[PDB]
Design a protein around this ligand. Structure first.
Ligand code: MG
Lengths: 152, 134, 240, 69, 240, 232, 169
């Protein structure tokens, strides 16, 4: 449920340093089962609006440290696999995918000033894989454009 | 009269925003030229309800029915094997018939299973219900 | 077309057909059931649901999983009469093997006997062709697990995993894309795939009571039937 | 040549399947794949839309009794 | 038509209109039902007196195969008699070769095969009968089997046969069956078989009652019917 | 049974055998295959396709040995083949029991054809639905005969059964000659095999055995694919 | 035993990848008597593979015109029809490389009697086309025209001339 998993994630964001990172990532697939619910078209998605945010706090800890090449490809590969592990096509196509990758490019905005050439273009090479087939896709793709512009 | 359709479907003058919906029971008795793609684009296959489908339609007709909080839809579906939506509708009708019997304005669950037995019994006269596509 | 009594007896059509046996294949379809079989790296498993419309109807008296020998399991489809009558044939010549040759019969060989027997049911023109289907599994020395399918037509062939019942085309479609993609097969691999293919073809999410699971594996060659406890263990196992 | 057609789709691979296809069937194929990827909410075609393509149009081809041969 | 003639010819869809006819042919007979409590099995049958037609007690369909083995025939009568002779002969062979009581499973299975034998040729037709199989043991308990014209046979906790069949089994499942004593279940069925056949159809019928189980010491015998007469006193209070 | 005994095969008013005529049709509708006898032995190659990728190939077999120097293949319906296969198995055995020596090939074609012909004239049983091909290097010179549903048989330098046996027939008439060797005859046999085969022809798309004067032998998929080089 | 015989294919593949001709030309002759130890099928694969990898690379006539005649006469000693009949068609294509004035023209009198006498539908187009080369390059327009047309009508029976199509075009 949206509100329940929200108040739960509120206490789970504390466990970034309190609990081990990859243990928190083992705490991910439960919320990924919340994505396995697909209860309501917007209620079940607000969860993935949340745990993608907690995922970006894990990014703000492991990417804030050297855990960058390990933090990214382990993630975009499981969003890729998210079409098979959870409900296919991110279980609602959007609102938990749209702001998911949109907060991903918010992250990339936060790291373009920080993440050096190799890790920044491994991040870019992770999201451009989404540029091939799967990204925002409503009426913009300008998270795609806004970063592919930065690629030069 | 049919070849007029074959012409004015594809023919010379193309069409725009003109959608053709066809309905039949056995496709095997149709003209292949009419059956080729372009004229008849997609063939949608309708089949009998599964268990969950039967439960769902049963809930559908079961809505506006003065009854008791006693309905075991699951058992009725369990005895429910291969029945059209109109068939289950027939079940809801017959159960109400048994209710009119003895003039109990409510509905008991057992009349459901009885009507299911009757209707299911009535299908000892329907053979060759399937037809190969095309 | 109809010519003489090709529509009635086991004779040739003008096209070279014979309508009786092909009438017989869909004669299995009235059983209202679909079976599934799979072979693994060191194990093979059978599984098929049941329909218990009666509370008065017993539970243990519904099984189609038929133990032929201590190392031979089989499952049936079609009509219960032809199935059961098939059973005593299988058991019977099975024992006759041990009496004549000492050692244990090959599962392939027994399929040879059954297909040959069924051959005459079509061959003579004064005998009903026993419209049911046959499924066998068993471990082989220097060969591992094996699965075979006997038909009323009177032929057989090996496999790697196969289903039957009513959903042959669908289950085969699922299994072909399922296995050929370089699949490593463990025990719970083959099992979980077995439950999954059926539960997808039928879209059930069954309770652990309705279905049945036969099993043989090269750690205990005894043909084994599953208990609903462990069956539920695997059910929740695939239930992430 | 009209559709985007992502370069991971091998055309000849489906060409080998003889299948006795008519010319209009091809157009139905590319249509089915295209509306398939669109149903995926995608503006680019992949090979899966073609696997599904023959699994839709080329479907209804197999009924045989092995003992005939 | 054109295909339902033989017993060795498949319909163009895959069945046999011979057995098709014979089943409903049995369907037209009166009702005979059976049940089993926790420590026995009870048989009930409705018979029809036409006007006078016989010295009462004649031609009872409640047969008796073994000292512990009870029949419940329905449909045609004479073929049922032939079947009962087949069963008695069979159990005699089993006792002869092996020296103890035949298990109900093996007995019903053998009889089922023998029934299946008459569905594969043109020389003979199928049977026009059906029946029940009641047995009880101290090492086995209460077991009740059922046989169709086609050859299917297995167990129940209760079952019904005759015209009033589906309506009959309806209230049958209404009863608890696990903990019930067969003595109570006797007077119980009396309400069942006395809320069925009425006027403007047939005439004054007849209620016979077989009874085997623990209290019978495994021996099969008819209920003491005039004795204790609670079927009627209990099979009437349903006036409203 | 009852003992009806009445044959179901009668002569036409024109004077023809309708049932045999029909069985020849189903024989023609069988899988194609061919064999050749060239100056050292005989080679037999079939048209074996698995309808699905889930089949096993090392399970079912087509080129079948009878004795160490006698091979046989068929074209028709699979199931009826195995029966007469076993029959010939025994029938070759009793000869060896009588005389203590490997039965000559022509004797087998005699007795088998007798069994099939008598089985045709018998009552209440359709004839078989398969033609056969037999080869064996009995006393140096190998031999290659063909049976048929009518029980007849011939002696072919090389021929083919199945579909398009007339097209591959002519192809054999042209590409074939008086004498060759085993490998070359294999090359032409796979030539006509590809003459009507499917697209991909692998070790499992066909199967081939041979007779030599050293005895009968079967070919494995190893040397099959190994010979697949220089296709046709 | 076998790992070495496949190793001739390996090292020959090295001689063909690194780009040298004489080094392989010795490798061919080094394994001529070694051939007499394995099946005629694997021998077929070996001779075809080595000869084609040797021919397709270099325009060094110091060894090709000799070794090709080697494999041809050895085909005489082994009695294979298709082997010699293919290596001949390769041979005449080798002859055209030096603008051979008559032996490039004897392919008809030496091979066309066999090709059209056989059933072949693939090699006859090639021989007719190359013969269309030999007369145009040797100043004969009408004969090359008629032969080209014969290859045209012959090309109407191949289901897959994927490269021979443009070769004819
Ligand atoms: Mg038109």
């Amino acid at each position: 449920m949206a509100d329940g998993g929200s108040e739960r994630a509120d206490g789970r964001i504390v466990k970034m340093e309190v609990d081990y990172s990859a243990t928190v990532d083992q705490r991910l697939p439960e919320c990924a089962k919340l994505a396995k619910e697909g209860r309501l078209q917007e209620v079940i998605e607000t969860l993935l609006s949340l745990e993608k945010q907690t995922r970006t706090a894990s990014d703000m800890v492991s990417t804030s440290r050297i855990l960058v090449a390990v933090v990214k490809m382990c993630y975009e590969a499981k969003e890729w696999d998210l079409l098979n592990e959870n409900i296919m096509l991110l279980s609602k196509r959007r609102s938990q995918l749209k702001q998911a990758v949109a907060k991903m490019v918010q992250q990339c905005c936060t790291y373009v000033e920080e993440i050096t050439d190799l890790p920044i273009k491994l991040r870019l090479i992770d999201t451009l894989r989404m540029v091939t087939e799967g990204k925002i896709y409503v009426e913009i793709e300008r998270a795609r454009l806004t970063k592919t512009l930065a690629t030069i | 009269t049919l070849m007029e359709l074959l012409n004015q479907m594809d023919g010379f003058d193309t069409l725009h925003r003109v959608k053709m919906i066809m309905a039949t029971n056995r496709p095997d008795t149709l003209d292949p030229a009419l059956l080729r793609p372009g004229r008849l684009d997609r063939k949608i296959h309708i089949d009998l309800p599964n268990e969950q489908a039967r439960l769902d339609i049963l809930k559908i007709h079961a809505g506006p029915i003065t009854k008791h909080g006693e309905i075991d839809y699951e058992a009725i579906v369990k005895l429910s094997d291969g029945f059209n939506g109109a068939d289950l509708r027939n079940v809801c009708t017959e159960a109400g018939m048994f209710a009119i019997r003895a003039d109990h304005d409510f509905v008991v669950q057992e009349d459901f299973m009885k009507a299911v037995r009757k209707v299911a019994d009535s299908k000892k006269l329907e053979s060759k219900l399937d037809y190969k596509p095309v | 077309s109809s010519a003489g009594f090709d529509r009635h007896i086991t004779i040739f059509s003008p096209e070279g057909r014979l309508y009786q046996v092909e009438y017989a294949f869909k004669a299995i379809n009235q059983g209202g059931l679909t079976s599934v079989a799979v072979r693994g790296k060191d194990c093979a498993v059978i599984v098929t649901q049941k329909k218990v419309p009666d509370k008065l109807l017993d539970s243990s008296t519904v099984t189609h999983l038929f133990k032929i020998t201590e190392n031979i399991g089989c499952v049936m489809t079609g009509m219960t009469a032809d199935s059961r009558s098939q059973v005593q044939r299988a058991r019977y010549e099975a024992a006759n093997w041990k009496y004549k040759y000492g050692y244990e019969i090959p599962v392939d060989m027994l399929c040879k006997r059954i297909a040959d027997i069924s051959q005459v049911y079509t061959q003579n023109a004064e005998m009903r062709p026993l419209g049911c289907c046959m499924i066998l599994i068993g471990i082989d020395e220097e060969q591992g697990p094996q699965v075979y399918k006997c038909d009323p037509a009177g032929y057989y062939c090996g496999f790697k995993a196969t289903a039957a019942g009513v959903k042959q085309t669908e289950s085969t479609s699922f299994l072909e894309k399922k296995v050929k993609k370089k699949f490593d097969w463990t025990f719970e691999q083959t099992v979980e795939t077995a439950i999954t293919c059926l539960s997808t073809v039928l879209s059930i999410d069954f309770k652990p009571s309705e279905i049945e699971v036969g099993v043989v594996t090269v750690e205990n060659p005894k043909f084994r039937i599953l208990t609903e406890a462990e069956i539920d263990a695997h059910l929740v196992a695939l239930a992430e | 040549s009209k559709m985007n057609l992502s370069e991971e789709v091998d055309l000849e691979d489906y060409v080998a399947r003889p299948d006795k296809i008519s010319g209009a069937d091809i157009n139905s194929i590319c249509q089915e794949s295209g509306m398939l990827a669109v149903r995926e909410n995608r503006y680019i075609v992949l090979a899966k839309d073609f696997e599904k393509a023959y699994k839709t149009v080329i479907k209804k081809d197999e009924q045989e009794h092995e003992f005939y041969k | 038509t054109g295909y339902d003639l033989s017993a060795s010819t498949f319909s163009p869809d895959g069945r046999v209109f011979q057995v098709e006819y014979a089943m409903k042919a049995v369907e037209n007979s009166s009702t005979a039902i059976g049940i089993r409590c926790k420590d026995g099995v009870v048989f009930g049958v409705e018979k029809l007196v036409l006007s006078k037609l016989y010295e009462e007690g004649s031609n009872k369909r409640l047969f008796n195969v073994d000292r512990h083995v009870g029949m419940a025939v329905a449909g045609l009568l004479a073929d049922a008699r032939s079947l009962a002779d087949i069963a008695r002969e069979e159990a005699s062979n089993f006792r002869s070769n092996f020296g103890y009581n035949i298990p109900l499973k093996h007995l019903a299975d053998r009889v089922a095969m023998y029934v299946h034998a008459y569905t594969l040729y043109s020389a003979v037709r199928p049977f026009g009968c059906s029946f029940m199989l009641g047995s009880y043991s101290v090492n086995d308990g209460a077991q009740l089997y059922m046989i169709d014209p086609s050859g299917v046979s297995y167990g129940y906790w209760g079952c019904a046969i005759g015209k009033a069949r589906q309506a009959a089994k309806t209230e049958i499942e209404k009863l608890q069956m696990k903990e019930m004593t067969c003595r109570d279940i006797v007077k119980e069925v009396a309400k069942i078989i006395y809320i069925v056949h009425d006027e403007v159809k047939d005439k004054a019928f007849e209620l016979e009652l077989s009874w085997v189980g623990e209290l019978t010491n495994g021996r099969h015998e008819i209920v003491p019917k005039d004795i204790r007469e609670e079927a009627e006193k209990y099979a009437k209070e349903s006036l409203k | 049974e009852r003992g009806y005994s009445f044959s179901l095969t009668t002569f036409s008013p024109s004077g023809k055998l309708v049932q045999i005529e029909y069985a020849l049709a189903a024989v023609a509708g069988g899988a194609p295959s061919v064999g050749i006898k060239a100056a050292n032995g005989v080679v037999l190659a079939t048209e074996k396709k698995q309808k699905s990728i889930l089949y096993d190939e090392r399970s079912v077999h087509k080129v079948e040995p009878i004795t160490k120097h006698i091979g046989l293949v068929y074209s028709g319906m699979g199931p009826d083949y195995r029966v007469l296969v076993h029959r010939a198995r025994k029938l070759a055995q009793q000869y060896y029991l009588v005389y203590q020596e490997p039965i000559p090939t022509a004797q087998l074609v005699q007795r088998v054809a007798s069994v099939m012909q008598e089985y045709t004239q018998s009552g209440g049983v359709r004839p078989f639905g398969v033609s056969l091909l037999i080869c064996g290097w009995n006393e140096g010179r190998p031999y290659l005969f063909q049976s048929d549903p009518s029980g007849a048989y011939f002696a072919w330098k090389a021929t083919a059964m199945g579909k398009n046996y007339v097209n591959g027939k002519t192809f054999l008439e042209k590409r074939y000659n008086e004498d060759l060797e085993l490998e070359d005859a294999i090359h032409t046999a796979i030539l006509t095999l590809k003459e009507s085969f499917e697209g991909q022809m692998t070790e499992d798309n066909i199967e081939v055995g041979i007779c030599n004067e050293a005895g009968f032998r079967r070919l494995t998929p190893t040397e099959v694919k190994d010979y697949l080089a220089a296709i046709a | 035993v076998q790992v070495k015989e496949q190793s001739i294919l390996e090292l020959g593949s090295l001689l063909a990848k690194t780009g040298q001709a004489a080094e392989l030309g010795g490798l061919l002759k080094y394994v001529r008597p070694f051939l007499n130890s394995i099946s005629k099928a694997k021998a077929a694969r070996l001779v075809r593979s080595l000869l084609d990898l040797f021919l397709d690379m270099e325009a060094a006539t110091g060894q090709e015109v000799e070794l090709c005649l080697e494999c041809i006469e050895w085909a005489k000693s082994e009695k294979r029809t298709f082997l010699r009949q293919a290596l001949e068609a390769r041979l005449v294509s080798l002859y055209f490389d030096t603008k051979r004035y008559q032996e490039a023209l004897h392919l008809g009198s030496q091979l066309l009697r066999e090709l059209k006498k056989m059933d072949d539908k693939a090699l006859l187009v090639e021989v007719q086309l190359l013969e269309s080369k030999t007369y145009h390059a040797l100043s004969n327009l009408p004969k090359a025209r008629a032969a080209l047309t014969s290859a045209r009508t012959t090309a109407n029976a191949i289901y897959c001339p994927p490269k021979l199509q443009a070769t004819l075009d």
